[PDB]
Structure formats: structure tokens, C-alpha cells
Amino acid sequence: MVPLRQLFVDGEWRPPAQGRRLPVVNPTTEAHIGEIPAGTAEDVDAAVAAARAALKRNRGRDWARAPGAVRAKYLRAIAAKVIERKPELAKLEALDCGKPYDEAAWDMDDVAGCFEYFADQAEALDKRQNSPVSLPMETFKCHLRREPIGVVGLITPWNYPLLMATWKIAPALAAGCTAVLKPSELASVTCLELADICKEVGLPSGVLNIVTGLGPDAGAPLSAHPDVDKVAFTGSFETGKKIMASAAPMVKPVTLELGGKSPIVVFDDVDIDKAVEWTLFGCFWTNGQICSATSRLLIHTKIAKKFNERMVAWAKNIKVSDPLEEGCRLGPVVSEGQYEKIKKFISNAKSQGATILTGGVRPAHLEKGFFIEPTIITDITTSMEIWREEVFGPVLCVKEFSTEDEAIELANDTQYGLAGAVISGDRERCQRLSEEIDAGCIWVNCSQPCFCQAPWGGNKRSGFGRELGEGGIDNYLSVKQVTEYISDEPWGWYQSPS
Amino acid sequence: MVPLRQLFVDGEWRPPAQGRRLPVVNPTTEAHIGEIPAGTAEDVDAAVAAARAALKRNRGRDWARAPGAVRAKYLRAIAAKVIERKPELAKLEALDCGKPYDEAAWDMDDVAGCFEYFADQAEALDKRQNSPVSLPMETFKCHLRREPIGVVGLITPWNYPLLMATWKIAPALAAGCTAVLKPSELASVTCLELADICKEVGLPSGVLNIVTGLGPDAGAPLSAHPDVDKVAFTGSFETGKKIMASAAPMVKPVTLELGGKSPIVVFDDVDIDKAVEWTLFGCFWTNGQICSATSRLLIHTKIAKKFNERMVAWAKNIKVSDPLEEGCRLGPVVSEGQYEKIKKFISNAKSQGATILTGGVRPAHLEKGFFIEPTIITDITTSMEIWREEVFGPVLCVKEFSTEDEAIELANDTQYGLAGAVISGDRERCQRLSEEIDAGCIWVNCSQPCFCQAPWGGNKRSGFGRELGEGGIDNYLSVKQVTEYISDEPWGWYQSPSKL
Ligand SMILES: NC(=O)c1ccc[n+]([C@@H]2O[C@H](COP(=O)([O-])OP(=O)(O)OC[C@H]3O[C@@H](n4cnc5c(N)ncnc54)[C@H](O)[C@@H]3O)[C@@H](O)[C@H]2O)c1
Ligand SMILES: NC(=O)c1ccc[n+]([C@@H]2O[C@H](COP(=O)([O-])OP(=O)(O)OC[C@H]3O[C@@H](n4cnc5c(N)ncnc54)[C@H](O)[C@@H]3O)[C@@H](O)[C@H]2O)c1
Ligand code: NA
Ligand code: NA
């Protein structure tokens, strides 16, 4: 059902050194629909060697030190190809990761949009070169150079397979870096198709290299590679710790875009059905596999009863089916491992004394696949595992509040800090919550809309740094000051012996 | 001679919890001239707790979330007191770390300059708040808020005691952070005087806290503290690895400003005496204890012989003495441990077959103190320890080159990448070298001028990140996007329940 591709190293299709493979499991049927290479340390070494050789080739005039206008042409051309292959790519995305077709089509528009946005950033880089720095001494002059950081290691998750890859590839390429992409072993199909798009577009050999494989066998040697200049990582807090620990012996820079347990605070002065839809979107869209999921609902006590009943009616109305089926609004979760973890979180919540308001069972009409009904859990306590840990399934927990200070304390009662949301008709209250909730992104009267134009990132256990936005390219650039002594006078610090 | 201070926690002078002290060793006389608190994990905990309580007090309205213009007044008040106390601070700096008085005096001007630059940055921050972001959908609006990252841990070295502390304190405070400074156990005197200035200017309690002590006893608990939001570190590559490994289980962000082995490339088309002075300044000033030291001279074969002869004439003319003595141009090195480490680098070079062109011994006229003559080592080989490793003494190594490709390969033949320099009458050649040398700072026709207006940092084993410059305040700020749905239409992704 999916293409049979190899690893992409030095602009050519390369089989894995050890000849091992991993299955492509369809989450709707539980069947193997293909295979991806099982990359190892030798394959990573080859991809890093190719990225290194491409960066230094012809003093870097073919890519790295070439004008931004040149790299922008390949970026815009990759975006044109993704739009051209949109139905096949969205279908492969739904087949590989389980997300509804409508979500996967949205993802493909954003992939091209992100390549387009960063092509403009590459052209904007030329104007930023040799930027003067005003000094307090007329005897000196200063200018800034913004050079590619070098060979970058890009490690991504399975929840937006091609989009997560694009978030790192598009700015890294725009900056003039050469890269090694290690996408998730759970969803590598569309990334291998991007490799085909690059080959088809004639992207210079070795500029983008793709090594598929298991986290410990392909990800870990890439993260710890002595010849990788920077690691840009997106994944769990658990893996983020290993990524930073692997970089420490080489004082190697990293960016960490990790998990979350984001809150949504819904006040009593809302349009109930509008607030309910955004709460369901904030926890159930992407099949609940949202890094920024507003997975803790903080609902005002005055409307809680009515709100909870409206949520259950909307949740029970969500069409759960094969992601390729018309009108699908909930697909299966990515894999068996993920499904079992979500099952365990749900049973632990029941054991701890929580109430399953709705869901927490397989949908009646779907005997096969990693299908889970939209789940709402009430009578939650702050000490429960379900309140503290990232579930990564369509599982929402609910806590009531009576005052604005109780809501802010409960919203910040997390060791994470990726995102947050506030729903209220009171504008001044929305302003207060936007200031007081500790997170990289606060939504007002919504939850989840993520624009390429704005910086994205977490605080605390959600990691550090910001990706995307007008500073997105700067993650892959190194600043060099060039300071010149322009006086013909001797320095005059030391006494001349003559 | 030095003042007797305690730790500075929550606006108070606080003795260390375990009551232990560390001597203040005068490097000129080798004698104990005072004592500093030997802080431990309990003292670090109290400092972090005070910074956290100050950040959160009154919803951050009096500091963290106050306008940048309010914090700017305190940064300007600190700068004015530094100038007011300049001769006494410069004298204490020379007594504590060993640098000549004229250098210590320059550092105090740079301390005040840095606080003034960051006060302007705090006022500029107010203009940057709530910045709009244009979106490709009219149903949404987006603005950016730049908030303090929170409680920050600032760990610094002894080579520019008050200035290194200032490089981190000024932008952190400008951003609205609260901080805990852990300065070096070898030079804590002026940093403790900064705490006295903070008290004098009425800095709100807990905003700045200072815990002195040994690196493993005070530095390490700070770097690994669960309530520290970010660690800004300056020190060796050896320590930098520990800082980053300590932060990893908490996914705690860090910036690392580490060591270097920076090259200076001198072409034949140069005024000899002018290139010589900059070469010596790039390796011997700060008594050779320069992170960005151009410790590797790459000299063109056509002028190498005359260049070495002129370097020896200038070096032998440097007045080596007590840093408080008029005309001092080279003081002793900071400590006995450093003095011994430098002597070992010189003997290992001699043992490895290198030539001691000049110096390499203690001055005959100075019986006491950690004094080492200006040293130049020639007939170097790239396998030698002296080529590879940071010496941190007034010790220069010399390599000859005949081609530009050879000079570039040699310049980049290091696992460091802090800085570099090129000296040549050919401007196009100077530009080629500025592009090819892999480092954060390239000086042209000079070596060492460091302006707080410009970003500063290293590549490779020299660390990552940039301090100072227009982006310096951003190391202490965390961006928050505020994205609002402005449409009166329902989202319309899911279907409203209407089924029978
Ligand atoms: N923008 C963001 O902050 C963002 C976006 C999407 C997802 N996420 C987070 O990602 C997680 C879900 O993704 P996942 O299950 O793929 O996460 P994961 O941490 O298990 O793996 C992510 C990637 O890291 C690799 N990896 C795993 N172990 C590794 C190791 N030891 N060394 C190096 N690489 C290794 C994996 O193969 C994969 O490519 C969630 O926690 C989610 O919140 C964050
Ligand atoms: N801008 C820069 O890149 C820059 C500037 C100046 C100095 N330096 C570097 O600094 C070094 C000289 O300074 P130093 O001898 O004080 O360096 P150091 O690394 O030994 O110590 C620096 C600071 O870290 C503390 N520290 C030591 N061990 C620690 C540990 N285990 N955990 C936490 N903190 C610990 C020390 O007490 C001190 O405050 C040189 O390598 C020099 O190149 C770099
Ligand atoms: Na899959
Ligand atoms: Na001292």
C-alpha cells in the first residue's frame, strides 16, 4: 500500500549497511502495508559524512555560502511538488499514522506554506549580512556575519510526520545548513517521499539526507555524532533528557521541543457550544496526539454541569472510522504500543478513583485497529497520574474551579509549560490569564491554531528554544562579529623598546 | 586589606550556614589578605528561594513584570556607584586577581558602560512588547510578549572578576529576571562590593543574590538546582561539560562561554612594530589569562625572523611588577595552582622539542609572587600540547606559514572556536580570512577589543550561544505568543449534535 524506498544519502537511494528493515503497520487494520530501512550507526556516519562534504564542497558556493535567493528556489520548488503530490501524500500520511484524511490534507498545505515562508526568510538573509554595529569609539568598526551553523541533526516525532520534518528542514536549509533527518520509525513514509521530491527537484547532493530507523539505533548515534554541529529535537520529555545528556560531552548545542500537559480555562461567561468545540478540538484532534493538547480542562463551577453534558453530546457525535473514509473526525491511534499506554493511563485513573464520564472503551463498530472512543475523565484529583502525565490519546481530564486565582494556580500546577488557553467574554480577564499562565503559547477563545508566522516552544519540562516565526532561521545560523581597528596610530598600550 | 563581607541573600548580609571561609590570597605577596564565605548547597538553596520569592512577589509587578524603564533606573544607579567607587574597586581588583591597575581601571569603566548599555536595552524592551504578528487568516490575531525566563544562575570566572559578573547580571536584570551569582573562589572581592552597591541603591530584596564558594560546593548545586530556570556559564571546556550534564535531567537551558586557542594570522605586508604590539596584547594582557587570547601566532615565512626579533625586543621591555606599582604592564598570575599549571605547560613544551625564544622563567628581580616572564615559544609542531591546549599564562606559540590555504588550515586546526585575528595591508585578504576562520569573533588589524555593543561567543569546544550586543537581553527572555480567534462564527470542524 506504501512505496518501497531506501535511505537517502548523498542525493542517491542507499540500502541500509546491515540490510535490516522495519514494518509499516496500518493502525486501522493492524496489518503490515510495507517496510522502511532499519538504519544503524554506519548509515548515520555515511549521512553525516555526506552532509559534511556537501557543506564544504567548492568553498560552499553551491549551497552553504551561496546567496539565499539560490536556496529559496529549491525551497519554493519542493513546496510546488508537495502541492502537486497532495492527494497521494495526504493518503500515505493517513495510512502510516492514522490521522483523518482532512487533517492530513491540512498538514500538506502547511508543509508547502512552511517551505514558502522559509524561502522568503532565505532571501531576507542576504539583506541581513554584514549588518553594521555602531561602536562608541571612532577608531573601530564592526559588522555581523550570519553563517550556517553547519551539519544539523534533525530528530522528529510521528504525529505530523512530514510537517514536523518540514519545521526543521525548511529553516535549516534556508540558513544554508546541510542536514541529516531521523524521522520517527512509526511514520517514515512521507519523509522518504520528500527525499524523492528532492531528487526530482535536483536539490544538491548531500544537502538533505534521510536515515530511517529505531530511536536507539539511528537517533542516538546522530544525537551523539562528533561531526554534527547542532541537534534540533522534537519528542517526549523522557527522550529530551537523553538528547541533552548525549550532547554534554561535546558541549554541542541542542533545541528541545518536548511534551506538555496544557490547561484550558473556561469561564462561566461563554457561548457553551463554541467553548465545547474548542475544548474537544484541543484534546481530540490529531487523535489526541497533540503536543500542545489542552488536556486539562478547568471549568467554572457555575456552568460545569451543563458544559460536561454538552461535551459528552458533541464527543459521542464525533465520527470515528478508517481515516480514509468520508467525514472521518477521529481515526485510530498510531500503534499498538501507544494504544496499550493509553489503555494503562485510563485503567490507572479508574484505580485512583476518577470517573469515566464517556469513552474509555473501543467504539462498538470497530473490532480491529487501535481505536479508542473520545474519553472524558471527571472527579480528578491533582495528585493523580492522569492530571500529571502526558497521555497522548483522545483523553480529557476535568477539574472545576470557582475563582480566577484557583484557575491560575491549577493551570500552572504542572511541571510542563508548552501551551495554554483561556475562554471568556471578559477581555480584561483573558489578558490577565495570558500573562499569568506559564507557557510558550496562550490561545484566547480557541485552542490549537499554530501559525508558521509565530515562534513555537515550551518552558520547564516542555524544553527550551523557539522554532518558526521571524527568528526561526536564526536557530540554524551562527553570528560572527568582524571588528576592525581603522586608526593608523599604534595601539600605545605597551612601551616601544625603540 | 580587603573588606570582610558575608553572602548576599534577600537584601541581607548572611554568614554561610556551615560558617566556613576561604582565604583571599594576594598573588603579588602570596599572603592571605582577607576571607570570603565558603558557601554550600544550603546557602545556594536560600539564595534560589529568595530569587524565586522576589520574581513572584506582588504578581511580579515590582520587578519581573514592571516596565523596563523602572529596572533601567536601578541599572543606571549601580553604574553611577561603580564610577563613584572606581579607584577603590580597581585597587581591590588588582589585589584580588593580580591584573595591573590600569587594566582593572579599564574594567571598572567597562562595568559601568555595560550597566548603561543594558539600562537602554531594558527601555527598548518596553517598545518591543505586544508586537503584532501578521497571519494568513483574518479570523485570528497574534501578538508577542517577551517575559523574563525567571530565576537565573550566573557562574563566572576570576579573569575579569566584576566585569564577567556584570556581563550576566546587567542583561538578566534588564530582562526582569531575578538572579543568583556564583563568582570564582579565586576572585570574589569586587563581586561582594557589588552586593554593597545594590543595597546602597535600594535594589529590591531577592533580585540579586551572591553566594561565594568552591566550584563543586556552591557552583554545582546552583547549576543543578530544580528552581533555577536557566544557567549562564563562563569557564573552562572541562567545567562546561559538567554544567551541561548537570542541566540535562531537568532539560534546563544553559549558555556556555568556554575556553579557546584562538589564532592570529600576520601576513608579510604589515607594519612590523604595530602588528607586534597587537600580537603581544593578544597573548600577554590580563597576564595572559584571556579567554579569547590569540595564543597561536601564524606568521608569514618572509617576515618571521624579523617579527620574532621585534617581539622579543618589545616583550623584554614590558614592566613586570606589583600591579599597584606605576607603569605595571604585567602582574603575577592569579594563584599558585595556575602558576604551577603554566610552569608545567612551559616544561612540557621544552620536553616536546620546542624552543623557548624568551621568558619561560620567573623574573630575577621578584623573589615572591606568582610572576612569570612574557614567554614566546617557537619551532612548534601541531602535535605539541602547547599548540592544542589553553595555557592561560603570558605564553605565545609561533608557527610559520608560506601560503594562505596553509595559514587557514593551521588557523582552523583546533577543537576550539572562540575568536581569531588577521593582520594584513591587503583588505580583500583580510575579508577572506574573516570568512574562513571558524570563530565567534574575528579582529582585523588588531586583537582583543571587546565591545558590549557586539555579540560574543564561541563555536565547538568554546561552547554555544552569544552574550552582549542587541540580542544579549534575549538570552534572559522567553517569548510567549498570544493567539486569539476573533471570528463570531463557530470553529466548524466537528458537527453539532442534531441526530435523533
Ligand atoms: N513542538 C513540540 O514541542 C512537539 C511537537 C510534536 C510532538 N511533541 C512531543 O513528541 C512526543 C511524541 O513523539 P514520539 O513518540 O515520536 O517521541 P519520542 O521522544 O519517543 O521520539 C521522537 C524521536 O526521537 C527518536 N528517539 C527515540 N529515542 C531516542 C534516543 N534514545 N536517542 C535519540 N533519538 C531517539 C525517535 O526515533 C523519534 O524519531 C510527545 O511527548 C509530544 O508532546 C512535541
Ligand atoms: N567569554 C568567554 O568565552 C570566557 C571569558 C572569560 C573566561 N573564559 C574561560 O574561563 C576559564 C578560566 O576561568 P576559571 O578558571 O574560573 O574556570 P572554571 O571553569 O574552573 O570555573 C568557572 C566558574 O565555575 C565554577 N565551577 C567550577 N567547577 C564547577 C562545577 N563542577 N560545577 C559548577 N560550577 C563550577 C567556579 O567556581 C567558577 O565560578 C578559561 O578556560 C577561559 O577561557 C571564557
Ligand atoms: Na506507521
Ligand atoms: Na584572589
UniProtKB/Swiss-Prot annotation, chain B:
Molecular functions per Gene Ontology: 4-trimethylammoniobutyraldehyde dehydrogenase activity; aminobutyraldehyde dehydrogenase (NAD+) activity; betaine-aldehyde dehydrogenase (NAD+) activity; gamma-guanidinobutyraldehyde dehydrogenase (NAD+) activity; nucleotide binding; protein homodimerization activity; sodium ion binding
Q: What class of enzyme is it?
A: oxidoreductase
Per UniProt, which keywords does this protein have? Answer: Metal-binding, NAD, Nucleotide-binding, Oxidoreductase, Sodium
Q: Which GO terms describe its biological process?
A: cellular detoxification of aldehyde; glycine betaine biosynthetic process from choline
**EC number(s) of the enzyme?**
1.2.1.-, 1.2.1.47, 1.2.1.19, 1.2.1.8
- Enzymatic reactions: 4-aminobutanal + NAD(+) + H2O = 4-aminobutanoate + NADH + 2 H(+); 3-aminopropanal + NAD(+) + H2O = beta-alanine + NADH + 2 H(+); 4-(trimethylamino)butanal + NAD(+) + H2O = 4-(trimethylamino)butanoate + NADH + 2 H(+); 4-guanidinobutanal + NAD(+) + H2O = 4-guanidinobutanoate + NADH + 2 H(+)
Q: Which residues bind NAD(+)?
A: 156-158, 182-185, 236-239, 257, 390, 456
Which Gene3D superfamilies does this chain map to? Aldehyde Dehydrogenase, Chain A, domain 1 (3.40.605.10), Aldehyde Dehydrogenase, Chain A, domain 2 (3.40.309.10)
**A Pfam family the protein falls into:** Aldedh
Where does the record place the site Transition state stabilizer? 159
Residues annotated as binding Na(+) are: 96, 186
Membership in a protein family: Belongs to the aldehyde dehydrogenase family.
User: What is the protein name for this chain?
Assistant: Aminoaldehyde dehydrogenase 1a
